[PDB]
């Protein structure tokens, strides 16, 4: 016995994602390539977003990813923000801003 | 205890061969989990309107790149695209 | 479609500031970080540093840190970068390129190059100079010090031209290039073929990486059609 995720190179689980597009009420049949292409693209972006989490996880010197570095990795990025603008990391915090204006003058 | 069956094992998988040495947190192991859960939704369900709008009853790997296309901004879903294509192409291969 | 255009050649003598422009247009400006890359025939192509207007948050090489000054300008759709105490080892032509934020993508686009006048992770490109025929297959080699997974870049450079992108990620074809070329590899030791030459493949090929924050390129290899 082979895994379809072993058989098309992938570490998430094509056979599971193919039950739940049957199951999800989304089409009267599912095709082949279907649960392949969307397990393919699901990680991508863990893979993505895991990258930039670990990146500023070692910047902050720590060897372990928290909500804050997703939450850092996710709006320190254009296509990212705007892929999760409506979305809430719970203990993510924001991103340090202050606006110039309310700085110290001279 | 009934299995309640996340897909936290996989995104460990990726996350190993990604950052070899970096762990992950069990709160930034769920917000992970519901990130995936999260795209796997929104992509299964701009499909299933894709092939309702088109007359057709079966969502194709072609319903799931338009949808790719469709929701991931910019060169999000150029890449996306790739990984997707790759997957099949080699899938179709055995 | 996608232009960075850059300014033209500048006589500064040393001890002076210059600050040199990448108006970019053609694309959405703030979700494309802009990379500066230099190029003496001494050295080669080196990297100093990039911009991400999105958040104007800089990123520069420990070699250039001071040295180099990164500054956007959101409403001109313009990134300026200055140069401070100008001495002899600054006689370089300054390329501005676009990259994603994409960790996967490459420096896509190009600009102009500035010739500008005074008055770690190591490539290694096996091959430094290459003749061959007009039909022959080649192959350049980029052995890598550290493992980089994949992240690796081959860029094709006509003489007094802006280079030009050929495979990213170490095996995927650049838009618009014929599937020629080809990459390979993984790690350490990756390969870049070109299956049958033509004319216009006369030019030098350099491999840069992405996997560690300092940006290096290879030394170069020159091709040159019989």
């Known amino acids: 016995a082979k895994s379809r995720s072993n058989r098309a190179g992938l570490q998430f689980p094509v056979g599971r994602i193919h039950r739940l597009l049957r199951k999800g009420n989304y089409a009267e049949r599912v095709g082949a390539g279907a649960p392949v292409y969307l397990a393919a693209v699901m990680e991508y972006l863990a893979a993505e977003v895991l990258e930039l989490a670990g990146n500023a996880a070692r910047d902050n010197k720590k060897t372990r990813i928290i909500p804050r570095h997703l939450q850092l990795a996710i709006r320190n990025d254009e296509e990212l923000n705007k892929l999760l603008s409506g979305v809430t990391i719970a203990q993510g915090g924001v991103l340090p801003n202050i606006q110039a204006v309310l700085l110290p003058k001279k | 205890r009934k299995r309640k069956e996340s897909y936290a094992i996989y995104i460990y998988k990726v996350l190993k061969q990604v950052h070899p040495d970096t762990g992950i947190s069990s709160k930034a192991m769920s917000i992970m989990n519901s990130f995936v859960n999260d795209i796997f939704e929104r992509i299964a369900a701009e499909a299933s309107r894709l092939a309702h709008y088109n007359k057709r009853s079966t969502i194709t790997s072609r319903e799931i790149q338009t949808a790719v296309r469709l929701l991931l901004p910019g060169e999000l879903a150029k890449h996306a695209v790739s990984e997707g294509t790759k997957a099949v192409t080699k899938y179709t291969s055995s | 479609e996608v232009q960075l255009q850059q300014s033209g050649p500048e006589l500064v003598e040393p001890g002076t500031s210059v600050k040199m422009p990448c108006k970019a247009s053609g694309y959405t400006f703030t979700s494309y970080t802009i990379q500066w890359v230099k190029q003496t025939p001494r050295q080669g192509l080196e990297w100093i540093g990039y911009?991400?207007?999105?958040?104007?948050?800089?990123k520069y090489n420990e070699k250039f840190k001071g040295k180099a000054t990164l500054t956007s300008d959101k409403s001109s759709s313009t990134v300026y970068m200055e140069l401070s105490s100008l001495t002899s080892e600054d006689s370089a032509v300054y390329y501005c390129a676009r990259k994603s934020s994409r960790l996967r993508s490459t420096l896509d686009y190009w600009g102009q190059g500035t010739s500008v006048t005074v008055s770690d992770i190591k490539m290694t490109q096996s091959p430094s100079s290459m003749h061959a025929s007009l039909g022959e297959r080649v192959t350049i080699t980029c052995k890598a010090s550290?493992?980089?997974?994949?992240?690796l870049s081959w860029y094709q450079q006509k003489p007094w031209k802006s280079p030009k992108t050929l495979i990213y990620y170490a095996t995927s074809l650049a838009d618009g290039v014929p599937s020629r070329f080809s990459g390979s590899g993984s790690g350490q030791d990756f390969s870049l073929t070109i299956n049958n030459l033509e004319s216009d493949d006369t030019a030098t090929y350099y491999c840069?990486?992405?996997?560690?924050?300092?940006?290096?390129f290879g030394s170069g290899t020159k091709l040159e059609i019989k």
């Open positions: 911009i991400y207007p999105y958040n104007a948050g800089t």
């Open positions: 840069l990486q992405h996997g560690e924050s300092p940006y290096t």
């Open positions: 550290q493992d980089i997974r994949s992240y």
